[PDB]
Amino acid sequence: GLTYCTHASGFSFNPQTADAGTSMNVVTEQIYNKLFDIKNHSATLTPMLAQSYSISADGKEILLNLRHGVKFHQTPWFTPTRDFNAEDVVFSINRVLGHNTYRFPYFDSIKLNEKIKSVTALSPYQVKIELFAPDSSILSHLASQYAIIFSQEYAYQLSADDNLAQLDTHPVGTGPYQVKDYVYNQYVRLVRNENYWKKEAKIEHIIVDLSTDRSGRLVKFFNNECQIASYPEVSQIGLLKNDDKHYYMQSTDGMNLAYLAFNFDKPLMRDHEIRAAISQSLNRARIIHSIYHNTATVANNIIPEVSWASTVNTPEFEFDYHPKIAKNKLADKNLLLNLWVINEEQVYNPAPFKMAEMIKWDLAQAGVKVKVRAVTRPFLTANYDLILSGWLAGNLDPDGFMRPILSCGTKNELTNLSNWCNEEFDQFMDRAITTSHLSSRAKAYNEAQELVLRELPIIPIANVKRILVANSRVKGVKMTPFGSLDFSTLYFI
RNA sequence: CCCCCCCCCGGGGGGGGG
RNA sequence: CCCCCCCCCGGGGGGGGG
Ligand code: HEM
């Protein structure tokens, strides 16, 4: 038996209804399968519930050849009568599109229904996707944590009794692990799926512990009630070592960006002169040590270096810390600005309010008055001059993170906190998915990044590392920038 | 119930890359 | 740790014999 301890913050049996850029769902990574997986810095489509695919010459039609003999979980709440087929695929994508099955933040922010025309079953083992125009990002989005396949047989039985809410309370998937029992925001008890379509899970029983706070997580670990500890307290990390023979640490870089956005609804914030000066006033180097204790990189980029689309070696930032230039342009302007901070646990921010004080301090030195406000996620959904946020993405295709944050389509949404719209940026972004090749795609993505780093719609603060601690007994631990953790590969020695 | 071909999975052996 | 070929096992589909 293995125990995985992590935060109750962001816990869901459905990453589709969850707010985008906030989590990597460690639970749905084990109980649900996608059509494809992408687990390499080359973005190679690993076939999962889809054996293979082919794209029409014009680029507007994708055919998915689905795997045979795949069966859904046999749980107390559901007992399947048939194998996985095209009907389960058709139901799952049509739901997020808003089409006949007979708010999805991620899929809304990438505008899937504007990408996809139709998803239809040709054979029981063949699905046809119609596209409005060629999109080289479609299968990467269907390779993401958000594109899990649900049971059509289960949803038909649930819709029979108005019970379709149960889908997210009592799950049924094709994953290597199966849900046994749980208590909300406390624990999840997983059991190995015996009739899995791939190499079977090595550990029969896994418990996902959500109960303990960030501080007492390493406490529970060293008390041996916890064999893998995820997201530990940042100050506690500097107490640990890599020499120890009873525990090891594993870090990973990726798309985990903390940033500051300018509200472009504020006539002052639409001024490039003040935006470039505010950035010059911020000592982002000093923030990385006080907030992240060497578990982050000062970010002068939006696309991480682990992305296939990082062809720029992140050049020197033209609006980096210089308080003398900042003091001149801002003090004489006599500015007072409302800085909002989302009051929640952030994966890109261990201490978001502490950082908001360090920003309030750095800006006062250059003659800017900042008034920080603790704001809730739904209150924001219902005014700020600056907001402190970020993005965590496993999908390292910049269509999945740069489009939600900076595109015109998402301006009046929670994803684009800048309320920015640049038709030249949208130009590069649209171009980057009409071309199918990585050379062509990375060129347009670096052009858009270069535009973002000069127009300054956001100030990138940190390149954050996801950390975990594991016991020496536990082998088969592989932390990747591409997703959560695969519990299938875990085993004791 | 017995026998071919295709696809997929798992295992073992030979070869190739860090 | 990643990738070829051979062999074996299991599963799914098409074909052939009582
Ligand atoms: C490789 C170098 C290792 C050294 C030098 C080492 C040393 C020790 C020491 C000194 C203790 C007593 C507590 C202490 O004062 O540290 C201990 C206990 C223990 N060690 Fe190790 N250890 C090593 C590797 C491992 C590994 C790989 C495991 C995997 C299980 C392991 C499992 C344990 C366990 C479980 C205990 C507690 C008693 C027990 O469970 O049998 N050790 N070891």
Residue numbers in the entry: 35 to 136, 163 to 442, 450 to 560
The authors write:
Important for NTHi survival, colonization and persistence in vivo is the Sap (sensitivity to antimicrobial peptides) ABC transporter system. An essential system for NTHi survival and persistence in vivo is the Sap (sensitivity to antimicrobial peptides) transporter. This multi-component system uses a periplasmic protein (SapA) to bind and deliver substrates to the heterodimeric inner membrane-associated Sap permease (SapBC). The Sap ABC transporter is completed by two membrane-associated nucleotide-binding proteins (SapD & SapF) that hydrolyze ATP to provide energy for substrate transport across the bacterial inner membrane. The structure confirmed the classification of SapA into the Substrate Binding Protein (SBP) superfamily, as was predicted from sequence analysis.
Hemin was also soaked into SapA crystals. As with SapAclosed, SapAheme displayed difference density in the central ligand binding pocket. However, the pocket remains too small (approximately 400 Å3) to accommodate a substantial ligand such as heme, which occupies a volume closer to 800 Å3. Furthermore, additional difference density, corresponding to heme, was present on the protein surface. The bound heme forms a crystal contact between two symmetry-related SapA molecules, each coordinating the ligand via a surface exposed histidine (His 306 in both cases). Although the heme bound in the SapAheme crystal structure is present at a crystal contact, providing a stoichiometry of 0.5, there are no further interactions between the protein molecules. Therefore, there is no reasonable basis to suggest that the 2 SapA:1 heme complex shown in Fig 5B is a physiologically relevant dimer. In addition to native gel and ITC evidence we provide structural evidence for heme binding on the surface of the SapA molecule. This surface location is far from the ligand binding cavity and out of the context of any defined pocket and may therefore cast some doubt on the physiological relevance of this interaction. Nevertheless, at the very minimum, we can conclude that a surface residue His 306 has the capacity to coordinate heme to the SapA molecule. It is the first molecular-detail experimental structural evidence for heme binding to SapA or indeed any Cluster C SBP.
